[PDB]
Symmetry: C3
Subunit: 494 residues, 3 copies
Amino acid sequence: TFQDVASQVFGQPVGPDNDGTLYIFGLTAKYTEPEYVDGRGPYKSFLKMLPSIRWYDPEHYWTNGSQTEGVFKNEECVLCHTVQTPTIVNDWKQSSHGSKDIRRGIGIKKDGKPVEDLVGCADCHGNNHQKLEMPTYKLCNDCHPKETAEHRAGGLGSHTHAYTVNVLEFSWHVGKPAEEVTGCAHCHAIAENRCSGCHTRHKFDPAEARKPTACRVCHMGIDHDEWAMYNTSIHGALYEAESARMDWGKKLKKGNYRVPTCAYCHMQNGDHNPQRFGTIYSDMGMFQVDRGAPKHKAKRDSWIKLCQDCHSPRFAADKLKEMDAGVNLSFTKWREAAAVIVGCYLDGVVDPMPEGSAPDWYGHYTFSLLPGGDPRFYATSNLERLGLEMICYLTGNVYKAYAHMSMYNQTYGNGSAFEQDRKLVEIKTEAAKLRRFAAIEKKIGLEHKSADFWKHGEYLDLLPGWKRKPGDVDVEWFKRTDIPHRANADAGVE
Amino acid sequence: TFQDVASQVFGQPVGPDNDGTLYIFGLTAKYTEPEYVDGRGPYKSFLKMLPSIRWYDPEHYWTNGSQTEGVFKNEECVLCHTVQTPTIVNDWKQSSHGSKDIRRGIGIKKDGKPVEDLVGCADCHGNNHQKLEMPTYKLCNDCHPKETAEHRAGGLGSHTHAYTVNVLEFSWHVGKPAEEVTGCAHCHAIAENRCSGCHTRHKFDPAEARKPTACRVCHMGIDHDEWAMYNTSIHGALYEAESARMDWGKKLKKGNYRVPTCAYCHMQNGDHNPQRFGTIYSDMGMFQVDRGAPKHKAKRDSWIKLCQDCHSPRFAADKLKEMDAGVNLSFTKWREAAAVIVGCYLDGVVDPMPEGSAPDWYGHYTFSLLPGGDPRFYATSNLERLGLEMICYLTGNVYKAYAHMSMYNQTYGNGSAFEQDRKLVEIKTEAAKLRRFAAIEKKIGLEHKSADFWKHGEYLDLLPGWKRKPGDVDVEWFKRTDIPHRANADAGVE
Amino acid sequence: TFQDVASQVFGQPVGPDNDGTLYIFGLTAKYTEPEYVDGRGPYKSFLKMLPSIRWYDPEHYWTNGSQTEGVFKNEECVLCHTVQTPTIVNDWKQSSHGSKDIRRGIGIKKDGKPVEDLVGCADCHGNNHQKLEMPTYKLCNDCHPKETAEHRAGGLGSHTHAYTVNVLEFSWHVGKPAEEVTGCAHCHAIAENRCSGCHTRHKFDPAEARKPTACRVCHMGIDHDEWAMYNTSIHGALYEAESARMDWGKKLKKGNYRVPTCAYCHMQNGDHNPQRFGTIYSDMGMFQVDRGAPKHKAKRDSWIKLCQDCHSPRFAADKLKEMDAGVNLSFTKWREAAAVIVGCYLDGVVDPMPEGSAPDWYGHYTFSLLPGGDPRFYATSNLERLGLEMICYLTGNVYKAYAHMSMYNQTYGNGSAFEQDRKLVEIKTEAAKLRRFAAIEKKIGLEHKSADFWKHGEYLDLLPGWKRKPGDVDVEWFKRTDIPHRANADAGVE
Ligand code: HEC
Ligand code: HEC
Ligand code: HEC
Ligand code: HEC
Ligand code: HEC
Ligand code: HEC
Ligand code: HEC
Ligand code: HEC
Ligand code: HEC
Ligand code: HEC
Ligand code: HEC
Ligand code: HEC
Ligand code: HEC
């Protein structure tokens, strides 16, 4: 093994990664599995989670783990936790739940009756310290049914199904070791199962939720993303300029704000179903659609009217037309790139071919840009990786750059037209190299066999694609009509 | 076509991109041209703009597009727009134009007479709602001649000619479909034609203009740029630390600020010609010049004295000498890279050679690093792309990192020495691959022909290089002496 | 030369880079050495510094350079500098040193006696303007012995030895021209030799030092780093949300803060030896260690208790276990990558082989991933560069992403699992190309010789590896036991 050789060269014994030894460049450590619990969803036969899933899907995983015993009153919760977890108490004392002086007389009710007392630690977590509860939106619904019903009103691609569908059914999550993608589970699960993603516990302050910081921890990246798209627009620059002195205590409403934030435009008038204002779900802009077409007029008009809070509607209309035009141009480059990549596959010059790689997460040796394949950036060919990057990392983000008025990210920036250009050159470069090698090998009669490292290795060998077998899919999950579903190749049903 | 094949594989009909259909990965959609208007400048015979250029070059493109009819008084503008575009009115009411209580008695005059009344919507836009005006600096000049004259005093590479010259004459803009580069036109045109780039409409607040946020929406990137260079210096960190509590109402003046901002150093004492403090124009640091040489002493001394607002002049002098030294070292790596790239061209081993690519925007098949060629990151070879990245994205930004005291971006960061190192390896890697292929093909007698995808494709076919013909340049534009010009290969004149 | 040819093509004379000429793309300029002074440390025989090192290692390099003569009283320092360097005086007047009204009666003493007077310019810099002093922590120790002793209590990898060891002994610094790495010397030297890195001169405000801005100018990057890791966690988002209105005047203490900052967690209770709270030094996470192993329990428990200021200890424990699991998974990908890269070397297919490159900074032609080699991103093969990037830029930062609770940077972001994936594909791609070339060349009988540009060039020729000779190491430095040392190949001792 690599570890055995490295052990003799660097003079450090081989051992398990988890024993506490400081391994020199990690060279002689052997991978050990962390403790797992079973994952939920249609791939439950092999999907794993780390036990810390208890906090994010508590209905299915939460158990008692406290060493403190007793049945306590609310005031006892506060007195002790003032010493034991002081900031939780400080947050709670600065919240409407724990302070009547900041209440606005909203008219909150539980079981038809007004909630006039403080809402304490015990009211949300329980009175028995050995049977403490870790809540979800189901608790909040007792007293905030409107916000909860909206939070639960989204379709696929919204907070509503972020975890239940888009973690448990998603290829990139199910195809990887659980501990590699813990952050995916939690980011998506906080969005779905909690009410603290925007207004954090334990202050639960709406003023905090109106700030772009309420969204950007999740809405960033693929490198750049809507955070960078917003922050590099003039709206984002004005947010930075005015944040410290503007009145964040004002409701999200026409005329209450000079500078628009994520919440202002997407949680219009406090609507807790922010997805619904979108024209149409486009798989993060990977699917091409002209939002200015006659069939989408009601949606376009609604956006124009939102912009009219602070602008001429003609100006707004022009800007959204620039989006449509910019998006349509961006897809010519993706189609150019796709032709080159698929062309290489049809000619059999891709190295490795699907047969030379580890099997995909379905357990098949299928080209990733075919229907039934798994588009990905890992455990695949360079050509396939670059293709996925073109469509996901770049083409989708061009739409986001136009949607958020980032002149820079539309053009020179990350996720831009010019990044698409450069990626197209990279793809053509790979393709050209592949074709020059194949042409030479053909002519001189060399029989090329793709290297073993495309197929086997310490990480590649951990992939679940190796252990897929017939009948390992819970197709009853996919038969459910109460949630939407991803169109996975092994779904087994409609 | 690609669309036809994809249509049969994915089961979605081919169609135009603009009909509103949600196209699966955009695979079966066909590119349609957006509505265009003719562009201005020396390439007016084929340059196009989207119609939204009306807002940014209104003198040449603005037309009535309102549905509201009438001739109104100022107070009528305000009453109705309070409902129709509330934030504009709120901004205006919080501006000196719309509120006497915040005026400073500057002594503003129009046609020799003092402006003592409110300056309302009608005073800037007109009284007739069917003949509304969209202004430029020409309006502001009526009452603010000093600021306007300075705004118009810059040379090439300043706000003064950002659009008129550096959009309308620039290869990367004229060589691309209009809708791909809308953001370029607007970013550059806002800088040139407007007075709202730093102090935004409709508050027009100088305190806002003093903040780095007044500059960073435009002065960012190539990936990193002067924003990142400033933000990652100790000055930038202190700006973030002190922004919320410092007094931004103070004039840009020696002793009024602890933390220097872009405006402080470049709009010294409120000068609206920020380019003039620069030692010399260097094409964004792509041209090498030692700013510490005896011939530039007056400029260096002026910078040292600016720094002396808050520092020892000896310290400042040392720091600017570090810039000079760091810059000069950076150019050894670019010259190393250029030798390798040009060497490959001279040996004819570049794939594709210029003849194998689409023609450049001049309509020629010329190597991009020759005089008369078009240095670019798109529609070119990987080797040429990497070269352009070395000089533009990296070498120029090394200067910016030193100029703005970013220890990190000088060394490990984006646009740094170490990024130059890595790019040099990438260039040598490409060169080495090209030479190994050519050596093999020579010896075995394979006649390599560069792939068709370097030349043709859905995006490449839209490029204006294909439709260039003799006599399509307005050389009278280039003959103008009232504006500077870019030294374009097809200029036809001096 | 390149310059001579370029001179004839572009029509600009060859000349020295430093004469002030504006060189077109820098093509015809010739590199000149800047003025140097000798560097300190074990490579003093050839290590150079720019003379500006005077400010950062003043004990060894500071000299008089003032034109102002006289012996002055404190009040005279202030009166004149109010005109000459106004912000220094403004800072000083707003500091406890210069204003009794903001003193807290800490009980500061010098030579056993209470310091009750103002501490003026002369008290820190001297009274004679021709013998002015540029201080280090040695000055501050006179009145602040506790903070200084802690600042000096760190081991290797802390502020305490940042410059003395990790600049003067480090391969990447000693192997490069001085002016390329000025920023390295200063960043590391400010951390070691000064007391102004966090609370800047001349205000020396602890409230400023508590902010993340006190750390991020140095603690950023390798592209992303702990700044990005912190800023993209929910803690970082809350810092941005609350910074403008929170009370930064509160001591770093349990219950004084809702949002934790770098200082809060690493300078626990004002401890000026922030390294000591770390479990173990791991060379920036390049060495693999399971911080959750039984042997590290005291450290893990201490972190859990720190988190318990604001959280359940069970939650904190789970989060740190996610770190351990995530880190261990990350090292499988590095070991996979290392096997591929070393495998290529063992098979002799790396282009260039070490013999085809310039010598490393030791003066040897050694493969960079061997013991005694120099792991690097510059002046090496693409395969070796990509390897260094995998372990340093990526694998180390995965640990940082988990340590700072950045769900995004653990997974999709910079320095993440998915970036590791992509880098692994890049490495395998390079390896596969190298093996396909070698297999062809073998079969057709082509004797490949690696290109000259891997070995010689304008930058490569400046490297100190060329001028290394026996007996050029000051091994007495490495024999010192009062400082730690790097395990350099040419150390000559234990
Ligand atoms: C009833 C028993 C409650 C439950 C369970 C939860 N909340 Fe609540 N909430 C409650 C009251 C009586 C109040 C004050 C209403 C008033 O008249 O002002 C609140 C208020 C909030 C708000 C607004 C906070 C503010 O504006 O400062 C938030 C955002 C909020 N509550 C959130 C919230 C969440 C996420 C809950 C589940 C975990 C939750 N509440 C439960 C009553 C009750
Ligand atoms: C971000 C996407 C949010 C999520 C997820 C949740 N809330 Fe929210 N909340 C959000 C903002 C931006 C605001 C202010 C909106 C406004 O109109 O300005 C709020 C407000 C609240 C309130 C106060 C309502 C009141 O009448 O003033 C409550 C009670 C509240 N939110 C409840 C709540 C619950 C129960 C949620 C999950 C189950 C929840 N919110 C999620 C931001 C977002
Ligand atoms: C108003 C000025 C906006 C602000 C400020 C923010 N966004 Fe936005 N977003 C805006 C529009 C007009 C669009 C296009 C919608 C269309 O149907 O035309 C978008 C789109 C997005 C999306 C995707 C929505 C989808 O495709 O349906 C997301 C996820 C998104 N926006 C998020 C986002 C965040 C987090 C913001 C702050 C950082 C933000 N937006 C600001 C308009 C506005
Ligand atoms: C929070 C820090 C995120 C992490 C970690 C990952 N995802 Fe994500 N995801 C996030 C956002 C805000 C978006 C919405 C973008 C929008 O414009 O819609 C997404 C979207 C997805 C999707 C949809 C993909 C598609 O079909 O278009 C999927 C299925 C998804 N995310 C899953 C997922 C998983 C499991 C990840 C790691 C394996 C991953 N995401 C990381 C936020 C975040
Ligand atoms: C005369 C008819 C005006 C025209 C046309 C424009 N402005 Fe003006 N401006 C005008 C007055 C009377 C004032 C107040 C002067 C006073 O005594 O304080 C101003 C002020 C400004 C300022 C400063 C704002 C402030 O400090 O709060 C700005 C930055 C400004 N004006 C900008 C500006 C621009 C960009 C214009 C063109 C679009 C413009 N003004 C036109 C009078 C008149
Ligand atoms: C950024 C590059 C700017 C552009 C473009 C314009 N202005 Fe400006 N303006 C700028 C700043 C940083 C400040 C404050 C400078 C200071 O001394 O502190 C200002 C100020 C104004 C003022 C007020 C002048 C007064 O006497 O107090 C006015 C009237 C104004 N600016 C006018 C103006 C006009 C007409 C411009 C374009 C035609 C314009 N500014 C552009 C920042 C920048
Ligand atoms: C003073 C401390 C500065 C601050 C703060 C900002 N910049 Fe700067 N800039 C500074 C100098 C000393 C230099 C070099 C000028 C030379 O002649 O020596 C620069 C250079 C630039 C440039 C290029 C100018 C040119 O080449 O002539 C630009 C475009 C620039 N600076 C922009 C910029 C911005 C937008 C800033 C804030 C984000 C900023 N600078 C801060 C000094 C100072
Ligand atoms: C605003 C978001 C920008 C976008 C979009 C683009 N450009 Fe730009 N440009 C911008 C800045 C602030 C700078 C000045 C940098 C400095 O140090 O001088 C520039 C510079 C240019 C130049 C000069 C190039 C040279 O010869 O050195 C050109 C000709 C130019 N910019 C044109 C241009 C076009 C048309 C773009 C898209 C096709 C592009 N820029 C994008 C700001 C921004
Ligand atoms: C001790 C408490 C000091 C007092 C009181 C003053 N200065 Fe200072 N200064 C001090 C140190 C530790 C340093 C070295 C840099 C660092 O950050 O550690 C300095 C440096 C200077 C400089 C040179 C650097 C610069 O920014 O230009 C000068 C010109 C200087 N200080 C001036 C000076 C004046 C005039 C003072 C009285 C108002 C003064 N200093 C007080 C620490 C101390
Ligand atoms: C004695 C002669 C001093 C020397 C030399 C330095 N400092 Fe000092 N410092 C001194 C006093 C009398 C005070 C005020 C104590 C009080 O009772 O409040 C201070 C205070 C500071 C602090 C705290 C500042 C504050 O809270 O606002 C800082 C951070 C500080 N001093 C830093 C510092 C540094 C870095 C020095 C070396 C360059 C230094 N001091 C020297 C007395 C003396
Ligand atoms: C960042 C890593 C720092 C360095 C390097 C130095 N100091 Fe510091 N200092 C730091 C912070 C975050 C704080 C506040 C800590 C708190 O408990 O909240 C301080 C505080 C000071 C004080 C005030 C102590 C008092 O009793 O209130 C002084 C006098 C001070 N620091 C001195 C000092 C000196 C002499 C240092 C270098 C020699 C130094 N500090 C370095 C941040 C950091
Ligand atoms: C508490 C919530 C933290 C905040 C806020 C910051 N960091 Fe941190 N850091 C934290 C821990 C629990 C760890 C792992 C330590 C271990 O032994 O378990 C880290 C680690 C780092 C490191 C490396 C330390 C080492 O390996 O021993 C550095 C250099 C670091 N942290 C820096 C850093 C900075 C600059 C921060 C703000 C931007 C920051 N940390 C915030 C916990 C906490
Ligand atoms: C400030 C802007 C930096 C620059 C410039 C460079 N380094 Fe650095 N370095 C910095 C930080 C905050 C860290 C600590 C990270 C942690 O988690 O420990 C480091 C670390 C190093 C090390 C340790 C490498 C190892 O053996 O693991 C070395 C030897 C080092 N830095 C040296 C160094 C040199 C000389 C650089 C340029 C040649 C370089 N660093 C740049 C901060 C910064």
